Symmetry: C2
Subunit: 210 residues, 2 copies
């Protein structure tokens, strides 16, 4: 049923928030795999083969929390790992989960904006780094944190996501062009809602918290 | 595609309507979601069920279904020696074919639910809930359906027949197993998608070319 994140209490974030961030990632990955519209400029990418479902990593979440928690200008961002950072203006009437739902899409918007009609979106360049982190077919783990920071420049919502694996470099293949639901990179693969997955990953994510 | 013989004289579009219907009912039961778009009434919400697996088409059952309805006689040559469902709908002058085909199988659900008492165990067979029981039978995964407009002297009807694999259900037989949605362990290499169990073998098989 509901997702087992099983993260330590001291991370001080709700599973509902974790779910928003993780569902966001898989939604982007699924849109690319199925060549479906991303935002409600170029807005359709893919299709892609071997685009697999991401799972949470509580250690990556802790890294993300550490990068934003001091609320300093600038933040102690760890550029030695793949990560995305976003900041969102808060208004009097701002509702937290709406903010958390909307904020990450800014990474998709920023990246798409830099796509020219001729740009190979599946190939990395610095102008599309945030989307590339999200759609990296080689990375299956993510952890994100959020915080209302009172910076000297004013109060904002800050979101950081840290990713498994390596920082992408120039001209790396971010994802592989191919048919939706072609899933053969891993043993015992299946496809659900246009996103590849494996029995091993499903079995692991459904283990009870301990 | 469904790869069924040309002489069955039915489109894959109709086959998908019938197949999707069956798996919609099964997924509602598996996931304890409302069956009819009607969600105050608890007799409209059955389940959850464990080991409810996705159904697949069978061209030979379709042939048996077609044979039961094609002559348009009164009575029809229904073969009660196998599990089957029959639906007849008196057409109106502006009825559209595929719209009726999408609607009429639901009468099997509505008719069975109509016979549930508040304390009735809906996973336990009795003839009053036979049509729903055929659809939701966990021990059968094959279905084949046909449709035809018959000019009976008593009026022109859309007629739909679905034939099912396996045995005719008997009084007090367990139709499906009460248990957690997405617990799928009746077969090796199982997975769950949209609240419905499936296997890698069954996915591979249905995705083969004719
Ligand atoms: C956890 O987060 C809330 C803000 O959402 C904060 O007010 C609270 O003090 C935090 N708890 C700790 C121990 O940091």
């Amino acid at each position: 049923a509901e997702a087992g994140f099983c993260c330590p209490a001291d991370l001080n974030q709700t599973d509902e928030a974790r779910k928003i961030f993780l569902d966001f990632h898989n939604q982007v990955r699924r849109d690319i795999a199925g060549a479906s519209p991303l935002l409600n400029m170029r807005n359709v990418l893919g299709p892609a083969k071997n685009m697999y479902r991401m799972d949470w990593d509580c250690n990556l979440e802790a890294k993300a929390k550490a990068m934003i928690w001091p609320c300093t200008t600038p933040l102690p961002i760890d550029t030695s790992i793949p990560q995305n950072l976003a900041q969102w203006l808060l208004f009097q009437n701002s509702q937290e989960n709406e903010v958390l739902t909307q904020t990450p899409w800014s990474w998709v918007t920023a990246s798409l904006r830099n796509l020219q009609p001729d740009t190979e979106a599946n190939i990395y360049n610095w102008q599309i780094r945030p989307l590339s982190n999200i759609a990296n077919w080689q990375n299956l783990k993510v952890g994100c944190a959020h915080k209302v920071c009172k910076f000297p420049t004013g109060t904002n919502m800050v979101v950081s996501c840290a990713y498994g694996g390596e920082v992408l470099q120039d001209n790396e293949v971010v994802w592989d062009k191919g048919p939706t639901c072609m899933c053969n990179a891993y043993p015992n693969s299946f496809c659900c809602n246009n996103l590849c997955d494996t029995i091993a990953a499903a079995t692991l994510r459904n283990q009870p918290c301990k």
